[model samples]
Target: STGSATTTPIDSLDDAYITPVQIGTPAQTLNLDFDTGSSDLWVFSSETTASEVDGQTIYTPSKSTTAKLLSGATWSISYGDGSSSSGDVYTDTVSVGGLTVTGQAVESAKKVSSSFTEDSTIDGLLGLAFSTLNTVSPTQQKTFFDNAKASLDSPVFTADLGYHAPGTYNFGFIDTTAYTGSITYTAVSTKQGFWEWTSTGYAVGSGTFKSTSIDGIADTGTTLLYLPATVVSAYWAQVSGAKSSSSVGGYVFPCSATLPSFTFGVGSARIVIPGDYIDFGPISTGSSSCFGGIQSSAGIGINIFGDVALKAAFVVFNGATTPTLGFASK
Candidate 1:
């Protein structure tokens, strides 16, 4: 209980990082996306409608002797990209990395949207966001980390997301080998159940880092770095071939174009996201166009520092009294 468990993050088909987890008594292993953007550990299960079932795996409570149905209890969750899932509750053992939590609340999907039903790589979502964001009806549930924190040697976890490569996530312990230099700590003020913070400012290319305070959430489930329209415009303007493409969505630029670097500051700690990373990936396999990694979050009030920004640094999720965040060069 005082130690930690480790899991190597695997790259998913949808540009996602997934980790292995064991649920129930006999240990049904499932790969899940550990999302910091939402609070719900839900999975595809037998409860899911027949049409909703695709190639993805599903969990069945009856198969595990330890799984107990929480009658009258249900939950539903929806994501920003319109993906959603909902199901009844089960109180069973849930293990992450190598640590186990007894009687963790696991939501089993009986209803799911096409996005989720068609996603064969992601079996479920393990929400690392605050427990307050749990969507269970009547009484909310605590996340895996929250349920396991009290017995941990230190109430902390670390996220080391990589780009098209394996990364590691550690619970209750921070691996020094994963980061370099001193970890810069910043206060996290969460009123909306997200790891929201204000970066002093940001700059494009080789320019100076400005004082344009940006309020954003650290979301692992998200793939792009969402920013204001004006900010997105400024960066895309610097790139010669970059343009707004209705078909491709977001800003599209020639894959071969020489792009500038993007940097954001957090409490004087400057983190630079390289130009290559800004290219994201190809907009389509049929063309040489690529989508900009940083895009406008015009409709979504708060900006989001997704995988691109996160993978650029090793982040420490300190669940101590202050719930502060510590970042270091990876």
Candidate 2:
């Protein structure tokens, strides 16, 4: 006699983010922001000019004998924030947690912008998102997930989004232990490079707004939730005295009161974004208000579900077998 086990498939989205496996002895951890929109694992290098590589963590090739630079191939990337960086392609044995995969492609930056150069806490980004977006011209495409799929026990990779901590995104094997209930999925459109879906509406503190509907792309690379004008305004409207203030590159709010609990409806699933995440750091004005994850992106064509929104749910990427996304344990 034998027991039966049922397993569900993970879902894959266009802009899912992933962290990098640890590399080197004692395991130097590399936390990456995975982007299905682009491929290429890039980290700051020691060879970069001091002024150019200020804030990012630089990987010293000389320190690790396993690190190898790919000659003749150079790389550069520019973000919407007007920040950019350039570097040479390299290959090395990279590790993530307990997993080790050799001959992995990486970027060693020589030139970097203030956004990347100014921040010294983390080193660089690990591209586990999509194969089509891989920056290697000759290769044209080679995603970390695409490369790692064969090695994975299951032909699937699940993103434990919103698990452990806020703004936390994990990759690699799917931990089936989190799934206690049934999961439903939405069809993916091939035309768009990123996985996009439609939302019926959003609810906050039992205040359901039916008129609000949103259609946007899910991006792991983005740091904040870029909401449509109507939806953004409606969300902010829920919080009394929550006004839009300029911070970073977009709108931020400063509210003293505890924000209401909100849930976003996607099909049958209800993803809850906690109130703590709503309050960001204080602005220069000394106002002790809360910053919201949902910001106004009126002119932007599509809404972007960034780290803030992603941190609320467990997102699975099932691209290895099929194009789908499913909710994991939150």
Candidate 3:
């Protein structure tokens, strides 16, 4: 079996991507952020704090005949960006696109941080990371992908993230027409519970490729690309008015500055991100300084090839016994 779904950027800056998910009997349709960096299919629901709920849709298990409380089970999670949420667990029928899974773990948020409450575009998050990273206590649960992989024609899924447009997530098979040339496969290190891999090197605009190992994770949940300080600094240096300002945080440059494209290596293949993609958005409303799409990961511990980089190519997450990652030009 296989499934497919459309993911759309929630905001003009592509802050996050949301996909429609059907949960429980009779199906409570909710828009959920598909996150590859974490593992826990959580939702804003009847259990969520009333005061914390904004205009987001809620999934009410009480209305679903198939919803069963996972007595004694609970979950709480935090993201690298400091956003957090906690809730109780329930098992229910969950469906995405055309694939359905019975008794899928559905975490209902009882408490969510201000960051989540403010985001009205997303009702919750559907984690696609390894099951080992699941946050449930007492008894951990597998991710929707992990639970459905056996039924999938192949234990693989692809993320075709987009910039200023809608993207797609496909399970079971790769669409030959979705990408160009051949896919470059690389070994994945799941020790950190992420789609972590090492990139061969990088190049600034039309500059020569600097061959060096840059380890990072492909995280669809994050908004920007984060790399080593040296790499990030080098990229910013090419921009005429780029400045690393503490007030605005990170690197920023004049809105009209001549931006250069960025290139990264995946084996012998190279993926080039257009210059306009790195301009990001303005630091503030009506501001002339634009924030950068690439930043230093020194404070983040792990470098992240987030939407900024992922949107430039098609990414395949192979869930074989020995997992691997595949990248191709879209």
Candidate 4:
């Protein structure tokens, strides 16, 4: 079977992507974040406290005949941004696009942090990463992509993210028209429960390519691209007024500064991120200083190739026992 879904950015900043998901027997449709960095199909539910619930939709298991409690099961998860949520578990029928899975573990959020409550756009998160990263106790749960893998015509999924427009997520088959040029494939490491790969090298603006291996994860959940301090500094150095600032929390520069495009290697392919994409946004509304989309991952243990990077190309997550990643220009 093959399936496709539309991914809409939460806001103009492209902070997150929201996709429609069908859950329970009545098939309550909820907009959720298709997160590739974590593995737990969790949602806000009737069990969540009223105080914690903001403007988001809630999933009520009691209303669905097919919903069954997973005995003695519970789950808790924390994100890189310091947001967290936890709850009881239930097994129910879940569907995405037209692909359906029965007895899929649905984690019902009972408690959520302020960050989650404030982001009223997303109702939950549908994890697309490996099942080994599931946070459930007593028994770990499989991700939506993993459970639906068997019925899919092929064990693969593709993410075609956009800069400020809607993109698509396709399961089972690759859409040839979604990308340009041949796909450059690279081996993936799932030992860390992430879609981890090594980038061959990088180049700032039109400068000579720096030959160095950089390991990072393709995280759709995150908003910005994070790389080593050396790479980040080199890119900012090209701008006249750019400087690292503690008040701004990252490297910022004059809004009028001309930004330089960034290029990274995947196999022999070179993906160029437009300089405009790197001018993330102003630190404050109508502010003179603009925050950068590419920042130093000095404090972060692993570099992250997030939306800023993913939007520049089409990404394929091959879900085989021996997994691999595919990248293509678009």
TM-score winner: 3
Question: Can you tell me which runs of candidate 1 are displaced by over 4 Å?
Answer: 2-14
What lDDT does the true structure give each of the candidates? 0.84, 0.60, 0.94, 0.93
Q: Candidate 2: which stretches are off by over 4 Å? A: 1-20, 23-31, 35-37, 161-172, 209-213, 246-254
lDDT of 3 by residue, 27-130 (tens): 89999999999999999999999999999999999999999999999999999989999999999999888999999999999999999999999999999989
lDDT of 1 by residue, 1-330 (tens): 543434334443226777888999799988888898888999888888989888877788899999998878999887999788888999999987678899899999999999877778788999998999999988889999899999787899888877657777888888888888878888897789988888788899998777888888888888889998988898999998899887777899988888898988878888888887776667766778888888999888889999878888888888887798888887
In model 4, which regions exceed 4 Å deviation?
none
- Model 4: lDDT to the true structure: 0.93
Question: In terms of lDDT, which candidate is stronger, 1 or 2?
Answer: 1
lDDT of 4 by residue, 19-46 (tens): 9999998999889999989999999999
Better of 1 and 3 by TM-score: 3
For candidate 1, the clash count comes to 0
Task: Quote model 2's TM-score.
Answer: 0.81
Error at 62, model 2, angstroms? 4.1
Per-residue lDDT value at 317 in model 3? 95
Model 2 C-alpha lDDT per residue in residues 1-330, reported as the tens digit of each score:
111112111111212233544544344555455564446777777778877755454577767667666767777777655777777876776765445666777777787787766655446766544555566645553555666667766555554454223233334555656554555465544355566666656776667646456776666667677877777777777777777665454445555566766677767667777866555555445756545667877766678767567666666666654576665335
Clashing pairs in 1: none
